């Protein structure tokens, strides 16, 4: 029974913060609130009833109203459970060298980068891990 609130874009986190506050102060049965970078314009609010949310957002600034229907906890699960490469793994670059296969040579667990020895043609390329998908594993 998770709801979806249409806000101003870029104010999702701001509004979530105040939603949390009003709900504790006013004792409304709001259980979690979710603001994902990928879900701009929307703050997901988990609540007992729609009325709670209508009472929550009543006179909220930069809030444009509640979207009809609920969203299930099936559909939110991708956003709530976001690598693990090893030196020697072969990968394909998915984002200047798109479609190019390459062996991994240095894995940066800190900067979350990966250093790649292309199969084609001459120098090591380093990429965020985001920009590469594993193809073979050794």
């Amino acid at each position: 029974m998770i709801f979806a609130v249409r806000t101003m874009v870029g104010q999702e986190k701001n509004i979530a913060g105040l939603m949390a506050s009003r709900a504790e102060k006013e004792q409304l049965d709001v259980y979690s609130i979710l603001a994902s970078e990928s879900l701009k314009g929307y703050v997901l609010v988990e609540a007992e009833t729609k009325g709670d949310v209508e009472e929550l957002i009543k006179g909220m600034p930069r809030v444009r109203g509640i979207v009809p229907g609920t969203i299930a906890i099936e559909e939110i699960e991708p956003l709530l459970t976001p690598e693990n490469i090893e030196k020697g793994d072969v990968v394909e670059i998915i984002a200047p060298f798109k479609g190019e296969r390459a062996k991994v040579i240095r894995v940066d667990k800190h900067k979350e980068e990966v250093t790649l020895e292309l199969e084609n043609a001459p120098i090591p390329i380093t990429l965020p891990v985001e920009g590469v998908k594993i193809v073979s594993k050794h």
Binding site: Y31, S32, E37, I73, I76, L79, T81, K111
Partner: protein, 59 residues
């Protein structure tokens, strides 16, 4: 604030209150858990403790 590298808990301190683990500023997204007992989202994510949480964190 900042976000713990381990558990994603949001704080201003350089070490996390929940477990004394290092916190970073480079955190993205936000999950506010008002009630852990009654949140199916918090169940799924696996948050025991009420509080604000980042969704992703890096150094």
């Amino acid at each position: 604030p900042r976000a713990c590298l381990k558990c994603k808990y949001l704080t201003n301190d350089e070490i996390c209150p929940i477990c004394h683990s290092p916190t970073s500023e480079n955190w993205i997204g936000l999950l506010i858990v008002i009630n852990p007992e009654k949140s199916e989202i918090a169940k799924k994510a696996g948050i025991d403790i009420k509080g604000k949480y980042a969704l992703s964190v890096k150094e």
